[PDB]
Design a protein around this ligand. Structure first.
Ligand SMILES: Cc1cc2nc3c(=O)[nH]c(=O)nc-3n(C[C@H](O)[C@H](O)[C@H](O)COP(=O)(O)O)c2cc1C
Ligand SMILES: [Ca+2]
Length: 637
């Protein structure tokens, strides 16, 4: 079997209202990954086009790698899609975040073949998401491939899966790696080779049965445990369908060996040691590109999430790209993965929650980095049909993956005695005490109250955050949109949450600025600015380095306020962050004192006369900053 990438040069139309009978020579050319909302999804004004758009491409059978059956494979098509080959309506899909496939064989022909995909991201009441903050960028925003495979092949039609279910069970210093495969149109004479391989190639187990024994058990002696960032060891499982001696089909995946529990009082546990989960959420979009991300974009985000020392990532509010999950395995991050069951329960949305949950688990089951499954997000504020839906999903996730735990994110206002909170295995809350009213000191006591009233329900914070742009102040107060208040906000939240073992996970909202076309706030439109890093990933806000001081074992020092250069005071309050014991702040070469801090937030008092080149040393590490004295409060702040 071979794969034929089908990204290059599609004919696109926002104008057409019916699939073309014949290949348009008249349309606009796009390469995948593509989106028609990369521009009007990020400039605001609640105006981004939502509707049906059409893609059309021609491929010649003689140009494909040869196999007995042909599949179109979509890694991402937001939100709903209809596929046509040569005018024949082949399939239909609802869900912009999961992978799905269409068997082309009977409609393919010789000579030129016309493929048309009718993509739609319009409001309806059936397909989540519909009410949400983020922009639902329309279009084929991830890869499209043609799969050429034998008539006997590992399953390609069950909810986007591979037909490879690897389930490690750790037994003492050995692990038992159960391996189930699913086959389409297999025939009687066939056989199945199974192999696990080392991180450096070496074979580790192997079995071969006839095509009847779809389930096998292989064991690794002295297993190399995938154990978070510490040592994110990954094995590879691989299975080969063999007819006679030839290897006619093959399917592989990477995977990790670990156990984990969530203790209501002592937090999250990875392989029997307390492994506190302190991290961020992430959206799958970016300045300029919209949600049509390239592989280096996925890698750019990880490096910054990693440099900060996050240990967990909530991948809200939908299924992300496999290449992103793959990275999360490779670096040992602990993942929350969910479906867009968000904002408002839709009665005619039930069938679709079920399929996005089925797709989510089938396609991600082997990712050692996923430890929970998200049922919903901010789905209601009150104290019934919503309830039975939540049961179906929960029952489902447990019926399919009893090796992982269900969670959900609850809106701040929802009374903790709402029965639907009793459904998942764990719970987190989305609280903004200190941004949307309240004061930043309510967060710690709020989790204290949930823990008392419900001591057996592990409680987390799945969302918390505060907006920041390139505004500044020396009186930082909630609502001024300044980088300074966001530093303080997060300083305050870190002191209250990282110091409470029972909180099983904290997930900043959000790691990155992202596009929300309806918002008008801050001084830039259609943007949610609660990120720790800017939309184009090029700027790390000061808040980012507050978290580094607690989470990262890479030594560093960071002066805050580098962008607040002109200041109207006589002595100015410059915070510094570090994960070193003692830091010293210099003003034009003169020391101001050796301070030490338990919360890693060193505060300082700098006399502000003329130009003052500031320097901070902390062991090996050094960081420069500059300042000036004016009496006109510079109004670009
Ligand atoms: C991770 C995972 C992957 C699965 N992949 C397949 C598959 O590729 N093909 C298949 O027939 N069943 C697969 N299954 C099993 C089905 O879920 C199972 O047969 C189920 O009972 C079918 O019920 P349904 O028709 O309502 O989906 C998989 C199960 C899990 C947990
Ligand atoms: Ca817009």
């Amino acid at each position: 079997r071979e794969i034929f990438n089908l990204n290059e040069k599609w004919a696109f139309s926002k104008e057409a209202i019916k699939p073309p009978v014949a290949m348009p020579q008249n349309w606009y050319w796009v390469n995948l990954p593509h989106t028609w909302n990369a521009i009007d999804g990020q400039d605001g004004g609640n105006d981004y086009y939502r509707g049906t758009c059409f893609y059309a491409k021609e491929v010649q059978k003689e140009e494909l790698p040869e196999g007995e059956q042909y599949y179109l494979e979509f890694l991402g098509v937001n939100a709903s899609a209809d596929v046509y080959v040569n005018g024949n309506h082949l399939d239909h899909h609802d869900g912009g975040y999961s992978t799905w496939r269409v068997n082309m064989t009977d409609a393919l022909t010789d000579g030129k073949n016309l493929i048309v995909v009718a993509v739609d991201n319009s409001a309806n009441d059936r397909v989540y998401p519909q009410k949400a903050d983020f922009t639902f960028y329309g279009g084929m925003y991830r890869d499209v491939n043609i799969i050429a495979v034998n008539k006997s092949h590992f399953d390609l039609d069950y909810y986007g899966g591979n037909g490879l279910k690897v389930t490690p069970e750790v037994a003492d210093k050995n692990a038992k790696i159960a391996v189930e495969v699913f086959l389409s149109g297999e025939k009687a004479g066939q056989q199945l080779v199974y192999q696990i391989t080392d991180a450096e190639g070496v074979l580790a187990a192997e079995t071969k049965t006839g095509i009847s024994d779809k389930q096998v058990n292989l064991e690794i002696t002295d297993v190399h445990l995938w154990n978070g960032r510490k040592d994110p060891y990954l094995y590879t499982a691989t299975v080969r369908l063999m007819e006679d001696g030839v290897c006619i089909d093959s399917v592989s995946t990477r995977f990790g060996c670990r156990t984990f529990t969530i203790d209501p009082d002592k937090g999250f546990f990875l392989n029997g040691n307390s492994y506190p989960l302190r991290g961020v959420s992430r959206h799958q979009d970016r300045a300029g590109n919209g949600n049509a991300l390239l592989p280096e974009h996925h890698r750019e985000d990880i490096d910054l999430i990693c440099e900060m020392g996050a240990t967990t990532i909530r991948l809200a509010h939908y299924q992300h790209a496999q290449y992103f999950y793959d990275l999360c395995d490779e670096k040992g991050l602990v993942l929350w993965a969910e479906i867009p069951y968000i904002s408002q329960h839709m009665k005619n949305g039930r069938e679709n929650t079920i399929s996005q949950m089925k797709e989510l688990i089938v396609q991600n089951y082997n990712h050692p980095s996923i430890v929970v499954w998200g049922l919903s997000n901010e789905i209601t504020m009150s104290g019934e049909d919503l309830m039975e839906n939540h049961h179906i999903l929960n029952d489902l996730a447990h019926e399919m993956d009893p090796t992982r735990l269900t969670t959900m994110a609850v809106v701040s206002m929802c009374d903790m005695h709402n029965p639907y909170i009793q459904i998942p295995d764990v719970v987190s809350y989305n609280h903004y005490f200190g941004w949307y009213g309240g004061d930043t000191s309510m967060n710690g006591p709020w989790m204290d109250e949930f823990h008392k009233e419900f001591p057996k329900i592990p409680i987390g914070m799945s969302e918390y955050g505060c907006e920041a742009l390139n505004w500044h102040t020396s009186d930082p107060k909630q609502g001024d949109y300044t980088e300074e208040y966001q530093a303080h906000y997060h300083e305050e939240l870190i002191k209250q949450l990282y110091t409470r073992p029972y909180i099983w996970a904290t997930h900043v909202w959000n790691m990155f600025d992202f596009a929300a076309d309806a918002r008008n706030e801050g001084g830039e439109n259609g943007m949610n600015h609660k990120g720790l890093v800017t939309f184009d990933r090029k700027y790390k806000k000061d808040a980012f380095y507050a978290y580094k001081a607690w989470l990262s074992d890479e030594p560093f020092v960071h002066i805050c306020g580098k962008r607040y250069v002109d200041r109207v005071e006589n002595v100015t309050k410059v915070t510094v962050y570090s994960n070193q014991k003692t830091v010293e702040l210099f003003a034009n070469g003169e020391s101001l004192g050796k301070k030490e801090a338990s919360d890693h937030f060193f505060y300082f008092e700098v006399p502000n006369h003329g130009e003052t080149k500031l320097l901070a040393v902390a062991g090996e590490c050094r960081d420069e900053s500059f300042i000036k004295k004016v009496e006109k409060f510079n109004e670009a702040y």
